[PDB]
mmCIF file of C-alpha atoms in Angstrom:
data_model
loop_
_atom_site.group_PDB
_atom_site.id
_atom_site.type_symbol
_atom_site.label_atom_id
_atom_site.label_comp_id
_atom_site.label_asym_id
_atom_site.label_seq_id
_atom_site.Cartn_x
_atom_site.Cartn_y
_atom_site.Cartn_z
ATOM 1 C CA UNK A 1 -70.782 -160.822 7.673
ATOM 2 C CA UNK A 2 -71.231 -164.625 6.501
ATOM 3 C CA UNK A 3 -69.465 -166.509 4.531
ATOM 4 C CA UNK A 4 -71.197 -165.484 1.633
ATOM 5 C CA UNK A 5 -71.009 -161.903 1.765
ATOM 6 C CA UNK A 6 -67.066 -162.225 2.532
ATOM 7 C CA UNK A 7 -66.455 -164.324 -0.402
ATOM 8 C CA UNK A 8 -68.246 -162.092 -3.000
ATOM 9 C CA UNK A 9 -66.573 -159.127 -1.033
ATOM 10 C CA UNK A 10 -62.825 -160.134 -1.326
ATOM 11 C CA UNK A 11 -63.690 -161.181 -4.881
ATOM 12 C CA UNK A 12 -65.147 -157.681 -6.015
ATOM 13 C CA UNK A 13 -62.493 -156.117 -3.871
ATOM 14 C CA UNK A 14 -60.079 -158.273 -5.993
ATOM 15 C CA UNK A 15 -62.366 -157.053 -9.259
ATOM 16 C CA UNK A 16 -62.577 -160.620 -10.246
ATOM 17 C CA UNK A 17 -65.868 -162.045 -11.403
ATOM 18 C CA UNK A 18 -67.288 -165.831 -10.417
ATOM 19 C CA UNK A 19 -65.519 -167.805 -12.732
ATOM 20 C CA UNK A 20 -62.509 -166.053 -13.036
ATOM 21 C CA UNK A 21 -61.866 -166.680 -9.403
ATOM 22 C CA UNK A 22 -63.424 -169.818 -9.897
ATOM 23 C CA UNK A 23 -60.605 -170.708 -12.967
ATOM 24 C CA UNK A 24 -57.737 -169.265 -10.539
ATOM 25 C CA UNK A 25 -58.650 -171.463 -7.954
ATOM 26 C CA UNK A 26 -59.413 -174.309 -10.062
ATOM 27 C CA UNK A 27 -62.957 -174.757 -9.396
ATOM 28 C CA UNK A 28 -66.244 -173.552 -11.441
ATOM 29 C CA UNK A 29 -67.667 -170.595 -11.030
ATOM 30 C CA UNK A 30 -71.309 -172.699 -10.020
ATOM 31 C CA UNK A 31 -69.494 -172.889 -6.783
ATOM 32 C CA UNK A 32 -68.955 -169.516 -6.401
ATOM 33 C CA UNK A 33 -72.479 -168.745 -7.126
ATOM 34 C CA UNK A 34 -73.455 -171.198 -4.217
ATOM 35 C CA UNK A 35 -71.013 -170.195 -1.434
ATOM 36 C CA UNK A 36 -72.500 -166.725 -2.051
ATOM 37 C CA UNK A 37 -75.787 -167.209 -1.978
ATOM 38 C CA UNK A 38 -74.487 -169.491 1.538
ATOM 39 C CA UNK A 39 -75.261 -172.766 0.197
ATOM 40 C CA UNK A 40 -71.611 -174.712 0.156
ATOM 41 C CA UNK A 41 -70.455 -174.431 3.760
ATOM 42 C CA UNK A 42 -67.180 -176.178 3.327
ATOM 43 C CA UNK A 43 -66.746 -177.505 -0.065
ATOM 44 C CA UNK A 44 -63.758 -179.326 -0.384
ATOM 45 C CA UNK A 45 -61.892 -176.603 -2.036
ATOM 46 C CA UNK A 46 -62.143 -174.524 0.963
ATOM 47 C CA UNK A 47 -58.289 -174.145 1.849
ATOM 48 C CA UNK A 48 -57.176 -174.081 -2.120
ATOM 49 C CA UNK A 49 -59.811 -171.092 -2.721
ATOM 50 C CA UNK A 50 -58.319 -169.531 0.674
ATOM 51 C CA UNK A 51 -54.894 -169.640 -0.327
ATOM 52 C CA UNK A 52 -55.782 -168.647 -4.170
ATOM 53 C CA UNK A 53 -58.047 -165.522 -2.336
ATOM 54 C CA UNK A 54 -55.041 -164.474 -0.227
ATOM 55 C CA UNK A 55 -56.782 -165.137 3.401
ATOM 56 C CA UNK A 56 -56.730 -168.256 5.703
ATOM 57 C CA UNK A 57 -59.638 -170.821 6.150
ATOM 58 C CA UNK A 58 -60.690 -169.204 9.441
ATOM 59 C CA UNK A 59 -60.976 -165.725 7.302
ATOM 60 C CA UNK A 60 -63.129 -167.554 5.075
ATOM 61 C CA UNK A 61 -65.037 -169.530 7.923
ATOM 62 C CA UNK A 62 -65.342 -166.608 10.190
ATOM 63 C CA UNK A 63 -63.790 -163.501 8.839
ATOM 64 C CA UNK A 64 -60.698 -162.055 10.973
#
């Protein structure tokens, strides 16, 4: 998979929605809704939503 795809994966797999991920993290859900849909590549939030999701940066960049 993409990006995308792993980030509303981990998050349903978690049984989070958008913004409550988004909250946990810190950011809004809006960029949630964008990395899905593939739009944010890296955001600046990228390690702090990694660490808050449990995976590294390359999990989120490439998917290990």
């Amino acid at each position: 998979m993409l990006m995308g795809e792993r980030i509303r994966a981990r998050r349903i797999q978690l049984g989070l929605n958008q913004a409550e991920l988004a909250q946990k993290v810190g950011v809004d859900q809006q960029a949630i809704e964008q990395l899905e849909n593939g739009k944010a590549k890296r955001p600046r939030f990228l390690p702090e939503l990694a660490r808050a999701l449990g995976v590294a940066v390359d999990w989120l960049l490439n998917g290990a």
